[PDB]
Amino acid sequence: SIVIASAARTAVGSFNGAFANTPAHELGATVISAVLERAGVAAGEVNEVILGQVLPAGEGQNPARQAAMKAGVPQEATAWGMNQLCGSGLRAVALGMQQIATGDASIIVAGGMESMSMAPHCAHLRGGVKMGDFKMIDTMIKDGLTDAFYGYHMGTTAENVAKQWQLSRDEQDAFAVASQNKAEAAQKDGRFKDEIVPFIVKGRKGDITVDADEYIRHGATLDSMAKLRPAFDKEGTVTAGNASGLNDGAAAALLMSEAEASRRGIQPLGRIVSWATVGVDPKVMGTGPIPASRKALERAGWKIGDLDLVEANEAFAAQACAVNKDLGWDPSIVNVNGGAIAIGNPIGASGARILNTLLFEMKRRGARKGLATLCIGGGMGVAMCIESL
Amino acid sequence: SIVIASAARTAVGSFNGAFANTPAHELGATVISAVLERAGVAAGEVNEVILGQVLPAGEGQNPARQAAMKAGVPQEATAWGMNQLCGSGLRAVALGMQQIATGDASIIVAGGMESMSMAPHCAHLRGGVKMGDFKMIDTMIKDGLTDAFYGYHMGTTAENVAKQWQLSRDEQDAFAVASQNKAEAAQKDGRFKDEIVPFIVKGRKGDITVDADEYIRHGATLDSMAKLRPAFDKEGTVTAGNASGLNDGAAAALLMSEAEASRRGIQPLGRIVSWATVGVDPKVMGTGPIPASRKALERAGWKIGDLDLVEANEAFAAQACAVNKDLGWDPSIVNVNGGAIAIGNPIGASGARILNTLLFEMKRRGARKGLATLCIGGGMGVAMCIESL
Amino acid sequence: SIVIASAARTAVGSFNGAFANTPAHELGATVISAVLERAGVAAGEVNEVILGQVLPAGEGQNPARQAAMKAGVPQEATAWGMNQLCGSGLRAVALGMQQIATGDASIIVAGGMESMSMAPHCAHLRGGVKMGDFKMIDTMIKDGLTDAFYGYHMGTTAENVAKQWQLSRDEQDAFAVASQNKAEAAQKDGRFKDEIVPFIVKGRKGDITVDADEYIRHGATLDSMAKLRPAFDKEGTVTAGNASGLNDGAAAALLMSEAEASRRGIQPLGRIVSWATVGVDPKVMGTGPIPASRKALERAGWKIGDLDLVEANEAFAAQACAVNKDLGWDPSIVNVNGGAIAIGNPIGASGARILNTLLFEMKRRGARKGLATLCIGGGMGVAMCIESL
Amino acid sequence: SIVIASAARTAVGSFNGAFANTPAHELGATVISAVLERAGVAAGEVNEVILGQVLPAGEGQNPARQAAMKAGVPQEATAWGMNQLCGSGLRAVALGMQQIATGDASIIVAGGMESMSMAPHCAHLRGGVKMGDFKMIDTMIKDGLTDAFYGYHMGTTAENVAKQWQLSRDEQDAFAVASQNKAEAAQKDGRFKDEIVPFIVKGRKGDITVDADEYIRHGATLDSMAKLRPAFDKEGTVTAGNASGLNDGAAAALLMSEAEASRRGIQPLGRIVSWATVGVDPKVMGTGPIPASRKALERAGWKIGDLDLVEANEAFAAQACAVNKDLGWDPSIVNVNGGAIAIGNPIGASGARILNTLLFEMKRRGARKGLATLCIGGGMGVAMCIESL
Ligand SMILES: CC(C)(COP(=O)(O)OP(=O)(O)OC[C@H]1O[C@@H](n2cnc3c(N)ncnc32)[C@H](O)[C@@H]1OP(=O)(O)O)[C@@H](O)C(=O)NCCC(=O)NCCS
Ligand SMILES: CC(C)(COP(=O)(O)OP(=O)(O)OC[C@H]1O[C@@H](n2cnc3c(N)ncnc32)[C@H](O)[C@@H]1OP(=O)(O)O)[C@@H](O)C(=O)NCCC(=O)NCCS
Ligand SMILES: O=C[C@H](O)[C@H](O)[C@H](O)[C@H](O)CO
Numbered sequence A, B, C, D: 001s002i003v004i005a006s007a008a009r010t011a012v013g014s015f016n017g018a019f020a021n022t023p024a025h026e027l028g029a030t031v032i033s034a035v036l037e038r039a040g041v042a043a044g045e046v047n048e049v050i051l052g053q054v055l056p057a058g059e060g061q062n063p064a065r066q067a068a069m070k071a072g073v074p075q076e077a078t079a080w081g082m083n084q085l086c087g088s089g090l091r092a093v094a095l096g097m098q099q100i101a102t103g104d105a106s107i108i109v110a111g112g113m114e115s116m117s118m119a120p121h122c123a124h125l126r127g128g129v130k131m132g133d134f135k136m137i138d139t140m141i142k143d144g145l146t147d148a149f150y151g152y153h154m155g156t157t158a159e160n161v162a163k164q165w166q167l168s169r170d171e172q173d174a175f176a177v178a179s180q181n182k183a184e185a186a187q188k189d190g191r192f193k194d195e196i197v198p199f200i201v202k203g204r205k206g207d208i209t210v211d212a213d214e215y216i217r218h219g220a221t222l223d224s225m226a227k228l229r230p231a232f233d234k235e236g237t238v239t240a241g242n243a244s245g246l247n248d249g250a251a252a253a254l255l256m257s258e259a260e261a262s263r264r265g266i267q268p269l270g271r272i273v274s275w276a277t278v279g280v281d282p283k284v285m286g287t288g289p290i291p292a293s294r295k296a297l298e299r300a301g302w303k304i305g306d307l308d309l310v311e312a313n314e315a316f317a318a319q320a321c322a323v324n325k326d327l328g329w330d331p332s333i334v335n336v337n338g339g340a341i342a343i344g345n346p347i348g349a350s351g352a353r354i355l356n357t358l359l360f361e362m363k364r365r366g367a368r369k370g371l372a373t374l375c376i377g378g379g380m381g382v383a384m385c386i387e388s389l
């Protein structure tokens, strides 16, 4: 009754790199028209555009609408952004599906977008500062990366999950090296070409087409990996080697009923059989995908062994190992083309990002059942099982 | 089948006034706690918390989650923020309603929360400013009050509507006084008492309890209303006097299934019979609730004259006068207790604000079928039909 | 040799008080015009204007020249600013004297000006801030009041002196109340009228003439002084009450040779007989007036007992007391009309402010020998000896 | 009477180049240490340090004292900063001479230092902006390079001069290419080695020694110069190419009486025979060197033709050409090793920069009589005459 006709995503850019000066809605616009032409559906035929996005400060009114309008979606349609942190990009898609499961809409474009590069610094200033220094706050760190309850970085909560799971620095780096190698191989073997839609970075002094993930490091090695020093805990295990990076990107999916796609002669990349969102202790948020995926499975009624393919977002090596280690699913079907550690973590769009990677892989290998999950700041997690046709 | 067990709202604060230094989430929490108590539900029974919010920069990760946590809702539950501008507060309810209607949740706390006082200035400084002056941007205006396509204020889109609907300065001034006087009377007669849950402005040097909409000016003389000068157009028709204002606040409703409240023995404030959101020409965004209301009525099978009461958000005196004249609903049953012009307009919370006013004035005079509606920047409208039982 | 033909100062404004929005060069222009008028000297005759000023950030190119031009000093004259911290306004007078002594000028206007209220906050943003909070620095605090070697406020140097000289909280408070009561008495008797030139603060809703020192506290009590909390150390003895304030103002002197004043028939306020500047340990900068005053006295050929009047700037009660204790001059001849604790301390203008007060009191009482001296952040003192003609 | 015992300057760094993150006082301390070492004079013998500096915002209290203390000049000596714009570094040397002439000091280190790269952006925020964007002001542009009376850049004053003296774009471009080619030749030949002291930029990942002027363009062509667009007036003649640059550096001279140098057995770089400063119209400030140089020559009792070598600072080709035209000195003796168009223009330092270049070239070629002169924003010139011992 509710399928995903098509999907697509920009490449993931590196912090202050290829998209260092590109507003999120511009990446979003690209993804909106991309899915449109991939589904063979017109813009005027879109109901609503649902775009998760964690860091909008200063981009102007409702970037979801900015995105929709640039993309070519008519004013007659509606649009909005939503925030479940790095669970936004995927939640948005479950949100999109309900709209149609309720009869409120027929066709929805949903995903997420983020320009971590463009996130400004800010200060509350209306009162005036009679005297003394004041703080210009990094909205990226403050609003995206810092736990509002304990005051420390997500990274720290990985330190807590790690310590909790007795996960060694070596096993973490061990996971980190794999992700880079998997992601590297896939990229050079064009396993990303399908899902990536090139983005044209406009420039007075020449234009540049970006159609590849510039954050994947070629020839990652265990040896060079262990040379790095702790990033968060001065005597901790987490490093800029086994932690996800800061990135820019966008991704999305076209949503219509299964009877709707049929008329259009469209062959959907999957059907949503369920999803779930669950809460855990913020100190150890990285564990959230456990209850998340374990509810999704219970709803779809699937068994952890029945899953063919899974994409479990790689915020931190520590939390990934722990997630997999507990759910006990086949390691060789997890992040087949690499994970966020390598591809990047554009928070807002990560949920739609890994979604694409998931779907376009289920197709090229003939996978039927899958699952895409993510952990969330504040102690949450989002799930969704996909059932190819 | 989907009802609003209870609903509460803080008094609307004035700009830099009552809640000048109070974080939106602190405001939200009050509301969340209140709804639970007013219904009789316990915070631990809460599935998810949904809070619209347009201006959260620098408030830290997912202030929605922050609201639920401070309010008592355990780490088990989920929470998120969403953004549909001034329709955020009402949209959120339609969202929460959907979580249940899709059999995804059991109990939802939905509403909006806003601190336009605590909105900061920002700049993107990552790349650095090589040479020359730059602007620190007021997020409240940039992200909340300015059109992203034309670059002018919502006050100018109202100018557009006033000229295209030919509404004179006198006419608009008339509606402004009318809404003010109604606000002045409805308040003194304690008609706002039920909906308002007092907020405790914690102070190191003197604690303060606020439970009265302070933005309402007493004795609104039509004379001084025609003395002010245009605030947007150097010779326009819109002024501070006939335009809505900057305000703080949080407002919300508890949502469960009609069958759910049945067991709890709760006397419902009403059942949601439909809702809708439609886009209109950006330049004239004010005309949003016009097709948004016909849509919701169309869905509900109700005729405009069948309405027993109406809350049309007063963004401006022009858009207001325009919405009524076209929809042709009895002007006597619209904003019986006043409107945004006099009460205040907490962008993200406004949708719930008026929603609350709707449900309590319905119970007081004994209405069965009403409707709340708001216009949304970028050119959209949101509407929802409420049936008491 | 070189005489002071005339002098003038503005009243001293309180922090963000009377001159809250008045650029320093506007205050300076009024004092330049006053010295000229008082001496019967035309602006066209001025060779150079030299104005000490510690915090000119944002005021534009060379405020000394802006003030001179505003006063009608011809484009063919020159002007410059300089900075020896609180010593600036007196050092400028010494530098002006030297222009005449070496034959490079005939007529100099010299003193200082300062708008502590108008000093901005700042940040170096050229290299960009890739990630993480950064401070907006209060230039008043950072460039005016913080020791660059130890990183603590001048107030902390005040505590160092109090500890070293064993100066009790009670002794410091008595000194402070005494300063206030002397300043209040002098103000009431009219003793600041001769020195002050009124300043017209321009305004759309009326101009305001300022001609009284607004910082002086009328009816200051020892009880309220004693109840103040320490402002720089939890276990300290320096407070808001016994420290000087943050203030705006300007002050100057018109100089020329003694022979020149005779040809003009001017009766000068005094002959510059000697000056000196010497360094001390930054940790006890408040002791600077000791070696500087001794050196100046040595250069003049005077004993301490030879002095008839002294202005020793009151940066803090603690240092003012150390200085008086070490020099041993009769306290009854020092700051006889009160000092900076009562009158204010606009940094760059202070040394010329106290020179004004000294000069006009010498004239009033017929004192023959005077000395002005100030302490200087980073460990210096400056002193000047003046003899009546 | 007063001689320059020794001198030194840092290489001049490009805007945001080698010294992008080096506070001016660090450059200053290296040049102070250098003049001491070059003269055989110990830091403990220094009486005062005087350093021109136009842009010290955010550097902390009195950077002049910071430089001196860092170079080991004792706490008992004194130090101060001054500002006569581009004239500062040369004026400080005349001021330092005057300390010795009046018998108030024996040993002075004087010059200037400037970090245009480190100059911050600022805003006055004590009052408090209620609502809306505000400007962060580039202190370098506002306080260093904008005329205070006319509101336009020094570059516009150059256009004013180009029109009044009828200087074609082609003439200004030829001048600029010649400055570069002369500077490139001198650099390659080693003629800046003597004057330059190397500066060590401290880096966590490696110290870098800077001993070459990095702004000098190697192989500058007329074709590329001719292709540049006017930088200040769309129909003007002044460009990035024929204007001086924005730069960082410091430079100084060690001063003492001729009798003192003899006792020490020092062979001085020169005797200071005269100096002068004079004002002109701000609109044509680049002409200041004309009356200043003429006044200095009169004071020296020298004819223009008596000069053997000239350094006339190249603020802009237009003004440098006008200066040369009006004075009529042989252009073959002016800026023989290139000027500021090629070498850079670290404003507060520039006057002592060109003094250094002058002294070492006089020494090498055996020139008896030299003159250094600079133009000054706001309408001023400064010049100094030097004779070999
Ligand atoms: C001491 C200092 C930090 C205080 O500044 P501040 O943060 O504004 O604190 P205030 O000046 O507002 O004083 C605070 C309180 O003490 C009071 N107070 C000050 N003097 C008082 C007196 N003589 N009697 C009674 N109360 C007094 C205020 O009225 C005030 O009351 P409030 O808080 O209810 O309004 C500041 O003035 C300063 O730094 N002075 C020294 C500056 C300097 O070093 N210059 C160069 C010298 S080297
Ligand atoms: C003129 C000025 C505004 C330009 O600086 P800017 O805004 O940073 O721009 P640039 O310096 O990079 O110059 C721009 C271009 O010309 C080039 N250029 C400069 N000199 C050149 C030359 N001699 N030949 C060929 N190209 C040259 C650049 O490489 C550049 O090309 P790009 O933009 O594609 O990279 C600035 O240097 C200035 O204000 N100078 C005057 C300073 C002053 O007034 N001092 C005191 C005077 S009293
Ligand atoms: O007035 C605005 C327009 O109606 C819309 O922007 C348009 O329909 C779409 O963007 C598609 O071109």
Ligand SMILES: O=C[C@H](O)[C@H](O)[C@H](O)[C@H](O)CO
Residues within 6 Å of the ligand: A131, A132, A133, A134, C138, C141, C145, C146, C153
């Ligand atoms: O108290 C010590 C300082 O002098 C300042 O008061 C402090 O640094 C400000 O509160 C913020 O800069």
Ligand SMILES: O=C[C@H](O)[C@H](O)[C@H](O)[C@H](O)CO
Residues within 6 Å of the ligand: A298, A299, A300, A301, A302
């Ligand atoms: O866990 C309970 C059930 O087995 C599942 O919800 C099932 O898969 C669906 O009802 C669809 O068949």
Ligand SMILES: O=C[C@H](O)[C@H](O)[C@H](O)[C@H](O)CO
Residues within 6 Å of the ligand: D221, D222, D223, D224, D225, D227
């Ligand atoms: O072969 C010639 C050179 O490469 C020159 O540098 C070039 O022609 C000019 O600089 C163009 O402006």
Ligand code: NA
Residues within 6 Å of the ligand: C050, C051, C052, C081, C082, C091, C092, C093, C095, C096
């Ligand atoms: Na001076």
